């Protein structure tokens, strides 16, 4: 099916506690394959995936140098942002970015991404055209002007349509036994009385990959959106994910409720009931 490669970078100032920390982590879908942390004892591009270990020392070194230069660039950016927002040198601030590409089953580009947030708010994003920017406020308009003068978007486009797609295709091939394998959820429903009048049904999905999944409860065929407690999908620590959905049911009416599970690993959508 479709696949994504994305880097998630965080730079955070800490005045009085050294220069800002920069961490960058790369993922293919929900699999981390690289981390760089400027606070690591010897900062290096560090493999988080066995299929990356397969790339030679020149790949490592090339990316290591890009991450080290990116650490300095993000510190530049944090100093400029503090000034664009008239902020004092005393406070901690955070600049985040996400960039990368999505491809379909044939490996062709679906869309590219390059965007930034400052202090948890969107700041600037490359548009889906890969040619223009959307700036959130007058500070990001200054960055947009600088990047338009310097023809930054063209460099980004070239990365996203070229380098990014080419490497994603290569990673998918070298990692095909894991990256291209969807593991279906193991599912079950549990029942927990609350009182004589009601009980909880909890519908569980365990051991699945990738993390995207839909779990819903229906009463007599009607979606119980408003009345369902859905927990955030969570990692198990062995590459797979877990999730549950619970609804509070009147005693004796359990059989009127059905849990529906959709996942790319399943041959067909599951409908489950209590026992």
């Amino acid at each position: 099916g479709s696949h994504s490669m994305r880097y998630f970078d965080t730079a955070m100032s800490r005045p009085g506690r050294g220069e800002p920390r920069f961490i960058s982590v790369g993922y293919v879908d929900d699999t981390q394959f690289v981390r760089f942390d400027s606070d690591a004892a010897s900062p290096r591009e560090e493999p988080r995936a066995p299929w990356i270990e397969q790339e030679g020392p020149e790949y490592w070194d090339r990316n290591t140098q890009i991450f080290k230069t990116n650490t300095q660039t993000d510190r530049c950016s944090l100093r400029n942002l503090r000034g664009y927002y008239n902020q004092s040198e005393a406070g901690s601030h955070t600049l985040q970015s996400m960039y990368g590409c999505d491809v379909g089953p044939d490996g062709r580009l679906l869309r590219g991404h390059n965007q930034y947030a400052y202090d948890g708010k969107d700041y600037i994003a490359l548009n889906e055209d890969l040619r223009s920017w959307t700036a959130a406020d007058t500070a990001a308009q200054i960055t947009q002007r600088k990047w338009e003068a310097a023809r930054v978007a063209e460099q980004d486009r070239a990365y996203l349509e070229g380098t990014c797609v080419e490497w994603l295709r290569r990673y998918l091939e070298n990692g095909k036994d894991t990256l291209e394998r969807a593991d279906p959820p193991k599912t079950h429903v549990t029942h927990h009385p609350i009182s004589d009048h009601e009980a909880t049904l909890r519908c569980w999905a365990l051991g699945f990959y990738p993390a995207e999944i839909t779990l819903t409860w229906q009463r007599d065929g009607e979606d119980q959106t408003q009345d369902t407690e859905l927990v955030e999908t969570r990692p198990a620590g062995d590459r797979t994910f877990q999730k549950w959905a619970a609804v509070v049911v009147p005693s004796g009416e359990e059989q009127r409720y059905t849990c529906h599970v959709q996942h790319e690993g399943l041959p067909k959508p599951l409908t489950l009931r209590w026992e």
Binding site: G26, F36, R62, N63, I66, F67, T69, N114, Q155, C164
Partner: peptide
């Protein structure tokens, strides 16, 4: 490299 060169904001 899979990493992208970044630009100062």
């Amino acid at each position: 490299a899979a990493a992208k060169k970044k630009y100062c904001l």
